Design a protein around this ligand. Structure first.
Ligand code: JWA
Length: 114
């Protein structure tokens, strides 16, 4: 579906996050081979990234805004779960997620299909 809320997540939320200076590690799936992390996929069972979310928004994959929101959440949560407390990546995720939440607080309240 196209909804008012999904249009918002696409044109306001993703728009802001995608171009953020800290976005680059999150624009594509975590590549466990490239990064030397052979336990990554044993720990994280549902990988998620903004490239996947963006593509899903562009292709009208989502039925409701909450589904898109859950994918954003999964991406951040995977990052906090997998990495060490002191890894810079965790700070970058937090910075992006703060913006995610700020923008979500202003999303149109009632979902309507267009
Ligand atoms: C999709 C997603 O969540 N990506 C971020 C992410 O989540 N878990 C891992 C691991 C990652 C992640 C993705 C890409 C890179 C390159 C890295 S890193 O730790 O090697 N580099 C960081 C420190 C220096 C700059 C960035 C971590």
């Amino acid at each position: 579906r196209v909804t008012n809320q999904l249009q918002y997540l696409h044109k306001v939320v993703m728009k802001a996050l995608w171009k953020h200076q800290f976005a680059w590690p999150f624009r594509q799936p975590v590549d466990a081979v490239k990064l030397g992390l052979p336990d990554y996929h044993k720990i994280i069972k549902q990988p998620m990234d903004m490239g996947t979310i963006k593509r899903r928004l562009e292709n009208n994959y989502y039925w409701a805004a909450s589904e898109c929101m859950q994918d954003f959440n999964t991406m951040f949560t995977n990052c906090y779960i997998y990495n060490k407390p002191t890894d810079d990546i965790v700070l970058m995720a937090q910075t992006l997620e703060k913006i995610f939440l700020q923008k979500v607080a202003s999303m149109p309240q009632e979902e309507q299909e267009l």
